[PDB]
Amino acid sequence: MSPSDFLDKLMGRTSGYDARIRPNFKGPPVNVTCNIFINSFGSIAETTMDYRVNIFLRQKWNDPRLAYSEYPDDSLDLDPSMLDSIWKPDLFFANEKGANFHEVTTDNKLLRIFKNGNVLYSIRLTLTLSCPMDLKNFPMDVQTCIMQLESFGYTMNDLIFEWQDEAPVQVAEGLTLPQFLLKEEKDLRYCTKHYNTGKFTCIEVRFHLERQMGYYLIQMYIPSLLIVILSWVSFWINMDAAPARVALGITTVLTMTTQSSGSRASLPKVSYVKAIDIWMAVCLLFVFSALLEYAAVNFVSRQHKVFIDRAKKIDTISRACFPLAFLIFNIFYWVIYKILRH
Amino acid sequence: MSPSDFLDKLMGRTSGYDARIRPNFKGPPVNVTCNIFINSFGSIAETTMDYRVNIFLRQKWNDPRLAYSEYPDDSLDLDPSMLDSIWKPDLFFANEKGANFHEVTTDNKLLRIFKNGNVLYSIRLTLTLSCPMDLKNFPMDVQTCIMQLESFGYTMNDLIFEWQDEAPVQVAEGLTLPQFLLKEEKDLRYCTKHYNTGKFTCIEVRFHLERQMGYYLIQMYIPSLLIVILSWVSFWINMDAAPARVALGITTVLTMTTQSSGSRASLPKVSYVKAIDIWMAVCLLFVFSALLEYAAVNFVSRQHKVFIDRAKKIDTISRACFPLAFLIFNIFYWVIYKILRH
Amino acid sequence: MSPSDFLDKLMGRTSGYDARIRPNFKGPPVNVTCNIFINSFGSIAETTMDYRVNIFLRQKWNDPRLAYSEYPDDSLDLDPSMLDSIWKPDLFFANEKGANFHEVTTDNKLLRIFKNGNVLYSIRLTLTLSCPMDLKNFPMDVQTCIMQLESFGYTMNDLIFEWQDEAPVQVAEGLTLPQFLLKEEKDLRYCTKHYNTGKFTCIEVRFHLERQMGYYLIQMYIPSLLIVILSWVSFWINMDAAPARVALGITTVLTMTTQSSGSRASLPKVSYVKAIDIWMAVCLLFVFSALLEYAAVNFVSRQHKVFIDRAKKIDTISRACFPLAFLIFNIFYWVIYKILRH
Amino acid sequence: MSPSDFLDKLMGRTSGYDARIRPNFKGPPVNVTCNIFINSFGSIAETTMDYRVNIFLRQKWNDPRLAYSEYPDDSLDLDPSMLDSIWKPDLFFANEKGANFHEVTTDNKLLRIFKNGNVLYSIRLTLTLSCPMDLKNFPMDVQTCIMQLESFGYTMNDLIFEWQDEAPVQVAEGLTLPQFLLKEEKDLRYCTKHYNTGKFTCIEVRFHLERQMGYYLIQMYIPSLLIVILSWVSFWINMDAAPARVALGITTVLTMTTQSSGSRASLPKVSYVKAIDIWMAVCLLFVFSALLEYAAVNFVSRQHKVFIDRAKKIDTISRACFPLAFLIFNIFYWVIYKILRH
Amino acid sequence: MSPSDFLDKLMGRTSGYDARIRPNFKGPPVNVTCNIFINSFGSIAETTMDYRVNIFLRQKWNDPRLAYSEYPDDSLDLDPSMLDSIWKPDLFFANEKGANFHEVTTDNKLLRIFKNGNVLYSIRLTLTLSCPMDLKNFPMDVQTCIMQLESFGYTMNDLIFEWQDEAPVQVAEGLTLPQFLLKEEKDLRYCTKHYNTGKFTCIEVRFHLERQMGYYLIQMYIPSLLIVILSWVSFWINMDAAPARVALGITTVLTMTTQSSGSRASLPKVSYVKAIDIWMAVCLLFVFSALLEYAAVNFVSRQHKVFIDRAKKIDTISRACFPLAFLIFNIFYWVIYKILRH
Ligand SMILES: *[C@@H]1O[C@H](CO)[C@@H](O[C@@H]2O[C@H](CO)[C@@H](O)[C@H](O)[C@H]2NC(C)=O)[C@H](O)[C@H]1NC(C)=O
Ligand SMILES: *[C@@H]1O[C@H](CO)[C@@H](O[C@@H]2O[C@H](CO)[C@@H](O)[C@H](O)[C@H]2NC(C)=O)[C@H](O)[C@H]1NC(C)=O
Ligand SMILES: *[C@@H]1O[C@H](CO)[C@@H](O[C@@H]2O[C@H](CO)[C@@H](O)[C@H](O)[C@H]2NC(C)=O)[C@H](O)[C@H]1NC(C)=O
Ligand SMILES: *[C@@H]1O[C@H](CO)[C@@H](O[C@@H]2O[C@H](CO)[C@@H](O)[C@H](O)[C@H]2NC(C)=O)[C@H](O)[C@H]1NC(C)=O
Ligand SMILES: *[C@@H]1O[C@H](CO)[C@@H](O[C@@H]2O[C@H](CO)[C@@H](O)[C@H](O)[C@H]2NC(C)=O)[C@H](O)[C@H]1NC(C)=O
């Protein structure tokens, strides 16, 4: 029979289908099974506390008013232009700050109706999602980015969100992030929002992202190491060259302070100490201790023979003491920041 | 009976309900009780003088034309698609610069009608709200962010906004800010706008936000302290090393000026002195006084035995005078900036 | 009688009211009296040559087709949803770069109809308005920001804009700007645009904004003063310390050039000299003259007893000559930049 | 007669006017004469290779189906709300990246119909237009910004764009640019786009903009001149002050490299040499040659009486050789960059 | 016959044409041949991992329901306003982050219907397309930017995308990029997306872009070369000038670290080594080795005649050893980074 007649004889003014009424209006709640395909992932900015994701959101639910038997097709596709005429769940994202559809040539939507009344509804979304980040252990950190799918208008007695049993979250093949490694396992949990209006259904998925240390080794750790070794260079210069030793120590301290200021250039104004802050503070303490050691040597050496050999002994002990103490600090630091993360 | 028939028999062309007419057209003003749930809070930029909030705004008002008795449900939910056909208050925000709804899969709207005609209307909004900030006491400050809910078109004789008696402002559990601590108590007050057009209803809520000092201690106060101690290092270097002492004092002064310039990098161009400005100015005065002290020593020492011991005495007094005077300044500063804030 | 029937019996298909026809189609031009309430003012960026304002624009005009006598209300309010069905003037802003309405919960619009046919139409607008800025006298400047209200489609023989006799421009109470002081008096004038299409009505209001000098004193003038005094420190250091004097002069000159470059960091690329440019150039000339004075002293002192006392005399005269000449420059500068602005 | 009846009796369902059909469907092509009024000009960013313009675009074309004789008005205005019902040319801009209309209180549109069927259609547009810039001769350059008006859907046999004979491009009085001077003469030419779909009409106007050199003299040329003179200061300092001469040369070279890096801070990553790049490279070569000259003097002077006078002779020749060679370079540079631009 | 009657007699309610049904509903899949004309190309940002393109997308497909024989025109154009009434493929871009149409005066759309039912549909799009970039070999790199055209709602059994046999991708004449050279050959391939919903058609085109090395030679390589030669200057300065040699080495090392930090200022936080990172690291190693060589000379020279000539021999060997080793590194570097790219 004519495919144009089936579209408005299954549903519409002739059949009496109402898009403002639930599939089971007075009875059990409608169960919507959701799954997501992550087309792209990235744009994780720590300053704005959010990340941008592109997903295909798939909702499956049973509508007994859309069941058909006379058509010989088991499952049939639709056009998106009639999606304003069917009932759809009022899903929304609790943590999103800005989102939009895609209309790039047509509406990026998919509708399938099965013979028993099963409805599959796939849509393409671009979400900017707020992520509360614990910026302690900041270079060696694992962040947890959440996604909450919630019903804005329907109480738990009317509508219930569930995750699909097989393949709840699937990721595009070859999807890589420039700054993180997205773990294979994704954690599903049942969030549930209680307000003064009622009890609303909610499903939460959280992703675990590990930051890579290559950029922070190249940018922050290795130049700070070179600044500390540059401070160690001062212990091999002779005693009586006051402008050389003082200028070296001053420039070392000022560059260390500039690097400590610039290490938090792309970070929010958090008020707890981080791993990179502790590293910068200890390196600044080391270069300041080197300059104070030279000040002690120069004060001792002008106290006039015993002063000369004592001030030479200070440099001799310092030459083997500063790299040894910094090596002990490096060993302890890298051990305790490679053990607490598990 | 049929749920499709009740929707257009309670209201519409058959009943005669008009969405352009108040619930009590010629009589007492309609009383709208409002409450808000803060889903997210943040993006407080001092430069653009605003902050971004995401809220659920709930309006409750009595519409006697929407009262029903024949339906056996005490309170019944709706679909958002019919919200263009009912009368809603013309609420707007007096201090917002930009705002939008959320349409992320459907309209993020909620409508409930009770048996007596009570209407509950919940909506999701993202507001960018201008906040006049008193940037005096700038690191140790408590800011007050206001939110005004006003009727644009209806005079006080037609429409009146009120706050809900229980739970006017409720905040999402676990909502934290990276730079502030939002106080538990929120202050409600009755703003009322008088124009040449008439007297319009208004309700104001103000939030108190305390800035945390951890970031400003790490970024501005501790490096300035290290620069001042670096200037104090000069008093232990010998007299005749003119390039060492002069280069140390010059680099100290230039770094202090650079830090004073950079402390206002993320601030609007206000024209009053702040706490961080006074701290930077006093630290700059201290390092300039250290360099002027060395200039005095070098001028005294070249005046040729009494000059040598007098110029050594200047350094000897300075070694115990500069940290003592800076300690007195620090004690007085931290006391007077921890007492005026209450 | 029924309020629903009056809305479509005063105007619409039954009455014959046409929204595409002027109130006096073949006769005198319609006179629209406009007034504005400035809700917020700010975001004045010199780089993008514009400023952002939020206004309530009120238009009053007489429509004899909307006159009523049978209704006992003298002046009656409307709903904004019918504003597409009445005739409204085609006002637009000639200098705006981007503007939008506000739809934050409903349309932020107001319509009132009086008994004689007077129509009051209030709307909420956010305007980004281009301001041609004369950046001469740049810190001590008074800027004039204009706002032109023009008819795009109606010639002067059809439509005429006028300012309201009482209260043309009123400003929100407590509205303050972080960088300017908006004067109480606002200047109204009759702009009139002549094109090849015709003569279009126009009304112009201009605002006078005075820049405050506190931020520019803290940021640019006082640090430059400290750099100049830092250059004066060189005249009290002894002659034979060549690295100290040369390093002080070099660092002073380089910091002065860096500050002169950074003083125009938030300004458009104008090609005339400003007050801050002249101040920076004279301070750079002073520090360069100090370094050239030391070069003269060092060249004179190595010419070998008369050379030694002549080179000491150069420093002795310089010690009282550089601050005196800079004081004369400061007195002349501040006088001539506090007299021409009136 | 009634003005409401003429609007739908001249055109519409009663007359049979179709807005999807050309004025001469099977015959000669419709000739559209276009002209533009530039309300504002600016926002020329070299990095994003575009500029923002605000124009009034006026199209005139003859529609014989809109001719009237019974109405006694020679030329009559319309309302913009009926512009969806008449036929309009499908003009578009070939080089625009983003554009929008203006709806600031109403649609910023104008329609006039003459007695013979002439249609004048004026609209307000804000265009972001891509400009291919030849950044050779970068401070002393004349840029050519083009604007192409093209028909997207109609072939040359259907629709032809032409420029108006009198006043094709007119500019607002008092329109000035902060960084350029727009020439009075504007060049019109007949672009014509050939694709695999067909031959489409096109009209091109190009504007000539001259960059002003005041900002680049203040920012880049004069500070580089001061750095070169600062390098020349080294030749008057004595021979044996190695830290003074070396520190002066090092700081001069580093500041010159920093200025050369910062001169391209607001420019795209072009891969040809510019005038400012050649100036920066020659100034860097001069300061590097000064430091290499001091290295030669210090190497010659330690070769031990003839060495001392030879190394003094090198400084003596250098004192008159470096400013003379730089003056020859400046004369040649400014001549060849003030002659090739014509 | 009348052109208005043919438009709604070929298709519409009279003919029975349905826009929600495929041209061959139960039969072979519809074959859509696509081609693109690149109007503009650019805005390639490595940080946001995307590039902006402006294209004309042309789709050709056979619709037997749109075939006509009575009209004497072989191929006839349409108006875009009826494109909502015909069936169009649901093309979308799999890698786009944001896209929009152009409505700059009308809809930038083109429709042509042939006699046999062939439909040509041309549209103008502005796409922001994500490009996974391999930032190894970063200055001497060839990037591959992909474009995937996919059907969102139609399975491979319903709709198939194909590339046009002649001219699949054509580029505007004179289109140049400021930072790349787009190769003449474009690679077409058959992507095909498999999801849990079904098998969707896909066509991929990839572009090869070569980065030009002129900007990176001017900005990063030549100044680093000058810093390395500036470090080589130290070997010609005398032994006993400790502040000169130490200050030169310190300033050289600090400028090298600043340049190494600034070379990744406009790059994403990748965690692998690049060519510019290796160049910066080797140059930093060279300047650090020069300073360590001076430290070795100064330590050897103060060990007291044999020490003096040994420390002079270290400088003598270093003077010919540092440029020779850097020349060997430069030769090896430029060879291995001009051979692996093929
Ligand atoms: C949605 O899912 C819930 C939970 O699986 C269903 O509720 C159950 O329904 C069965 C069938 O009658 C009952 O035997 C159980 O007692 C119900 N459990 C609860 C906790 O209510 C519900 O029926 C489903 N709704 C639909 C429309 O299928
Ligand atoms: C809205 O609230 C106001 C204030 O509570 C109500 O006004 C009062 O109404 C009662 C009931 O008749 C009167 O006895 C009082 O004198 C009124 N007070 C004032 C100040 O007007 C008003 O009736 C309420 N409106 C509705 C529709 O309930
Ligand atoms: C709009 O204002 C103008 C100017 O005030 C009015 O024009 C005058 O109208 C009076 C009344 O007939 C005449 O006596 C004057 O000669 C007119 N002056 C001019 C310069 O035209 C005009 O009538 C007003 N329009 C309306 C509709 O009130
Ligand atoms: C649009 O302009 C073209 C060119 O001026 C017109 O084409 C000419 O029309 C005249 C009038 O019949 C002929 O004598 C010429 O031979 C035509 N020249 C060409 C090159 O075609 C055209 O008629 C105009 N169209 C309209 C509707 O006025
Ligand atoms: C779309 O293209 C496919 C592949 O070219 C066509 O499929 C072929 O159709 C011919 C014609 O009957 C058959 O002989 C082949 O066996 C088909 N091959 C396959 C792999 O299916 C298809 O017919 C085309 N569709 C339309 C509407 O023209």
Numbering used by the authors:
A (entry chain B), B (entry chain C), C (entry chain D), D (entry chain E), E (entry chain A): 8 to 311, 386 to 423
Please share text taken word for word from the publication where this structure appeared.
Glycine receptors (GlyRs) are pentameric ligand-gated ion channels (pLGICs) and are permeable to chloride ions, inhibiting the cells on which they are expressed via hyperpolarization or shunting inhibition. The subtype GlyRα3 expressed in nociceptive sensory neurons of the spinal dorsal horn is a key regulator of physiological pain perception. To understand the mechanism of two such endogenous modulators, Zn2+ and protons, we have used cryo–electron microscopy to determine structures of full-length human GlyRα3 in various functional states.
We first look at the effect of different concentrations of glycine (submaximal and saturating levels) on the distribution of the functional states, and then we examine the effect of Zn2+ and acidic pH on this distribution. There is no substantial difference in conformation between the desensitized states determined at 100 μM and 1 mM glycine.
